[PDB]
Amino acid sequence: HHPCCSNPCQNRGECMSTGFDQYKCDCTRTGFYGENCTTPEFLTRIKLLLKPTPNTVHYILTHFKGVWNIVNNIPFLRSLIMKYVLTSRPYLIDSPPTYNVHYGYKSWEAFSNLSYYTRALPPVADDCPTPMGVKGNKELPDSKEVLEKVLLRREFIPDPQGSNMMFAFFAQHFTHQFFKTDHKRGPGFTRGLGHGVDLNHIYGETLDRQHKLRLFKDGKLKYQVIGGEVYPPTVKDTQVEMIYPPHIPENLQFAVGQEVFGLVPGLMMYATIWLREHNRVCDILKQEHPEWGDEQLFQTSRLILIGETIKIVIEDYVQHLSGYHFKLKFDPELLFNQQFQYQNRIASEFNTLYHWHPLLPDTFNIEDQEYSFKQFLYNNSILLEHGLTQFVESFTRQIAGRVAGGRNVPIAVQAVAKASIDQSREMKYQSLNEYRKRFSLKPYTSFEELTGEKEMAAELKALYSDIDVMELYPALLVEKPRPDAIFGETMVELGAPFSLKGLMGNPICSPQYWKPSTFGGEVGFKIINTASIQSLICNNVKGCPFTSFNVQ
Amino acid sequence: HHPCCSNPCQNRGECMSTGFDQYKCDCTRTGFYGENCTTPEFLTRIKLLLKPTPNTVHYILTHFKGVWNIVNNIPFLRSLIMKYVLTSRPYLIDSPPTYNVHYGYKSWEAFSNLSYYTRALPPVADDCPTPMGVKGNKELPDSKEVLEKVLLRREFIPDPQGSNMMFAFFAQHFTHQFFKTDHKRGPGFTRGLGHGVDLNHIYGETLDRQHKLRLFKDGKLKYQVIGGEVYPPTVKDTQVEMIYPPHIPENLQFAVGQEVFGLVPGLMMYATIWLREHNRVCDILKQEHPEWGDEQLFQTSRLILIGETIKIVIEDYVQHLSGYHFKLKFDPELLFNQQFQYQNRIASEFNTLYHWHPLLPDTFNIEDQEYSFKQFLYNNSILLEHGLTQFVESFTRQIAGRVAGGRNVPIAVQAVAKASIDQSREMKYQSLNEYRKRFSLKPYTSFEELTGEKEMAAELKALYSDIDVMELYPALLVEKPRPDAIFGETMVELGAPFSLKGLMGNPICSPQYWKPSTFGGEVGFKIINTASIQSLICNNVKGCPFTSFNV
Ligand code: COH
Ligand code: COH
């Protein structure tokens, strides 16, 4: 079989077959050498001893609040610290991208073809003896068995950081613009050829879909008015293909950028908020530029809302996740004197780790009601009956589930959580400890080190035998959470660079784009640099209800 | 009308309307400020003082040959100068790209839609009173008159640098992988969504076309053997769509990556050569990796040829073009410690300046024959009759025409030259002087300064009335050439950044790609780093004839 099946090359060294049963490791710019790239250079040997562990870094960022209070209020220091945050993890991500599900080696097909999700690690070769390479049994444990033993939820576990439903639905809405998996081809393929924050879930992936959603007046998007309230247009009026069960009323079949946003009222909530924000920005720009035509009012507004989305995600969404005392800042200027590629390619592993099913509650508490999944699905009437204001007020108060720690996936979505395990095996992912080493983390030496607990670790060991063949996705959900946090180490050290890559890698963050003229002048620019999840809701939802990503 | 038709903002400042009759300049990171971004800051005054003119920089690289011969033999020193060359033009090209033919302002459509050629300068607004903005008459002079008076060829004017027909066809074959105008949409649209050196003119633009060209054994491409010589396969054999006149027999319809390479035997030459080179690399890779399957042999071979092409283009093609005594070097490691975007977007203006019609001869001299244009087109039988070796031997000694200097466009392609002017106007190009200011050059004050003579300059002033409304393309052909050189100043200062970005911006030049393992080991890596126009011909053409881009 393939001589690289055992994954011998360490420290980002690249493995290559030299014969039928011999290999060679490419230690180019790894900082190491030797047959397996395990012998470090002198300078490398220094960089290792002086490198702080991720847990050491996390402690500092979550403690000494009196010190960060000083820093956060010194713009020079804040920008300086943030400059480090954004330049810290420096080569963890291949850009331009490399492998994908069909190529364990670099090729032009893998680079050019935008339909593929890219891969941080190459897949396991087909003719490898065991699923994870050479270690482990001839077969991985039954996925259902793994699901029910350590993943499925017994009793609802709240998020100790206090994440609410405003957060959970934002995460689903925001990420499903670049996590558009194309099941017609397979789990390794995507429909989001933009590979990042292009707001295609609001405007549409194709130009043909966009023009059906547009009004072609003042740059706005088509809309309807129900009970004096602005809601998205219908499938019938725009002739936009959406995903709805046949038994859904015509006027409740809303049409938006993403075909699947009719699935959940919480998504339609955000789909409605952003539609209003777009038309709001149109109004502001038309006031500033009465000379502009419809097309320019539209395009400029889209770039503005893109900036808003990136602004909010960093300084609200990621800030809440981090739990840091340090105030994250969105300022593209901090990369202009740095080496950074203004491009991005969505990793399949970035998709996989973002399956935060445990975030979901058992019921959805709106006003005085508590709907179940069977009731909540495709019930756009709920959104209408209650209104956006009561949606915001209710979802700001309702707590969300904990992602890590194990056993918190709702039974309602068991078929989805299991599908994540199966498709991870279809795309032939490498093991948990292989992705830890890939992102400069110490491999787990025991299942009890992974979960920090004896019970699930016992069950996991009986299922997998070896810790070195533990799978990625279930490990992320059963991993020992950081102190009073929502994630474990692996979720963060892998997730942080992937997230910040698609955010800062956007063209509007480039020097030639990051100008007032790009966004219609100082007015449009100001909309972005002052945007927040609070202001978003305050400007578009009636009554301006208080909101946040935390229940407090 | 649009408040920015007059092009008020200077020094890379961006113009924005703030009403029906007013505008506003964005002077961000220009080094200037004021209403029109024209008042220089202090550090700029320092840098504008120290800045040497391109005319004198070109002088240095073309003189003191004895000293360059020394520098060319000091690795550390060759390397360091080539690094400067790659970085001497830090912010000339927008990357990620900005405007196109439909968007004179930044937008997500202009950025994401890869069907567009990008634009170095935004188009003139639709409601502008004069074709160039506010200057000049209501209409530009008839393109036919501009064509006949100062563009068409009387006496054939040969290239002083000694460019041969190997050069002329290489330039045509090489650039037509990223110059594929989608004429079903317009001149501002491209069919090459790769926007760079992807060698799709060999392997095909889409995956389907590629699989119809591949043999699926040993990673090789389909081929036929005619008289012991290897040639591309037929359209019948591959079902690959090719552009041929109806009177071309089924056996002479060669199928290659590019759909239009069949029309010119000079292109079908390199198409055959590069197809041979591909299968040669597969042979080598197969005995380096007898364990490898077909798919990896192909994909790895495509990367090496991409590397070869960039290697050959820089150190042979661009080298001969420049005329510099300094020996250029293809070394991606020179950009690792520098701010560089490993991405590219083909500019429309890059396409326009590359319309080197004057490079063409009056006849195509092969062995004992002098073929006219009418005889040469679609005549792949010429290729079979003489052979590759006679083709290389003959095209090596046949000289090419001078691009700049005026009056050198062959009569046989006058319609094409007229189309370059018509379409530039169709795409609403800005004037010559605007594109000069865009590239840190000084605007021409008179037509005599532009041409360096009196006769043609008098002709153009009768046509255009103002030097500030002189079009970009016809100027490139009549511009005063550098001393015994093929190009004028504008052709160089525009084309040099565009060419260097398209080559180095290739993902294989990125640090994670520039590894021996990417190309199948040290053997395949050396194939890239030792590639040349002579080795390409020697390894693939029978007899290994001597060739270059000169003599
Ligand atoms: C990040 C938060 C999040 C939440 C709250 C959430 C909540 C819910 C939810 C609530 C009622 C339902 C019915 C589903 C059900 C699904 N989810 Co999510 N999912 C989430 C993250 C994801 C991600 C990431 C994907 C993969 C995107 C893709 O492939 O299209 C996904 C995909 C899916 C799919 C596509 C099938 C597949 O093979 O991927 C279904 C069905 N889902 N999920
Ligand atoms: C650089 C060398 C070169 C050579 C030797 C050459 C030789 C020849 C030749 C016979 C040998 C003929 C019949 C033509 C004729 C044409 N050329 Co050129 N061309 C050249 C440079 C170019 C370039 C560059 C383009 C742009 C291709 C595009 O935009 O699709 C081009 C485009 C064309 C087109 C497309 C239509 C148009 O541009 O309006 C035609 C027709 N032509 N050319």
Ligand SMILES: *[C@@H]1O[C@H](CO)[C@@H](O[C@@H]2O[C@H](CO)[C@@H](O)[C@H](O)[C@H]2NC(C)=O)[C@H](O)[C@H]1NC(C)=O
């Ligand atoms: C890139 O832009 C072109 C031109 O704007 C788009 O082509 C148009 O597509 C619409 C339908 O989507 C047709 O009705 C038009 O006739 C097309 N115009 C031309 C000139 O062909 C193209 O779809 C865009 N590409 C993407 C990926 O959105």
Ligand SMILES: *[C@@H]1O[C@H](CO)[C@@H](O[C@@H]2O[C@H](CO)[C@@H](O)[C@H](O)[C@H]2NC(C)=O)[C@H](O)[C@H]1NC(C)=O
């Ligand atoms: C990207 O890759 C996919 C899969 O490798 C290509 O889709 C295949 O296309 C061929 C011919 O076009 C079909 O015969 C296959 O059935 C397709 N496979 C799948 C899974 O869809 C796709 O064409 C590639 N993209 C581009 C632009 O070439």
Ligand SMILES: Cc1ccc(-c2cc(C(F)(F)F)nn2-c2ccc(S(N)(=O)=O)cc2)cc1
């Ligand atoms: C999917 C994902 C994963 C991590 C991040 C991220 C990014 C950052 C920052 F600051 F670097 F931008 N922190 N940060 C983060 C840090 C700590 C936690 S915690 N308290 O659960 O362990 C959670 C998130 C974002 C998205």
Ligand SMILES: Cc1ccc(-c2cc(C(F)(F)F)nn2-c2ccc(S(N)(=O)=O)cc2)cc1
């Ligand atoms: C279309 C085009 C234009 C310029 C170049 C180019 C690039 C370079 C280099 F080396 F800097 F990269 N020089 N160089 C160049 C420089 C001078 C001349 S010359 N003797 O006609 O005036 C000719 C070419 C290449 C292609």
Ligand SMILES: CCCCCCCCO[C@@H]1O[C@H](CO)[C@@H](O)[C@H](O)[C@H]1O
């Ligand atoms: C909660 C709905 C799914 C339950 C499936 C149970 C499958 C066996 O799961 C068992 O459940 C017990 C209690 O949680 C644990 O003590 C055991 O460790 C575990 O193996």
Ligand SMILES: *[C@@H]1O[C@H](CO)[C@@H](O)[C@H](O)[C@H]1NC(C)=O
């Ligand atoms: C390299 O790894 C292999 C495992 O495949 C091991 O047998 C060998 O001893 C290692 N060699 C070195 C020098 O570490």
Ligand SMILES: *[C@@H]1O[C@H](CO)[C@@H](O)[C@H](O)[C@H]1NC(C)=O
């Ligand atoms: C939600 O759907 C259920 C049945 O599908 C229905 O009884 C209920 O009225 C709906 N919610 C609202 C607010 O109408």
Ligand SMILES: *[C@@H]1O[C@H](CO)[C@@H](O)[C@H](O)[C@H]1NC(C)=O
């Ligand atoms: C700017 O240019 C305009 C012409 O477009 C001119 O009228 C104006 O006086 C200029 N202003 C300055 C400060 O140079």
Ligand SMILES: *[C@@H]1O[C@H](CO)[C@@H](O)[C@H](O)[C@H]1NC(C)=O
């Ligand atoms: C070229 O074509 C002409 C007809 O257009 C034909 O007579 C001639 O034989 C061809 N050249 C060769 C070498 O066959």
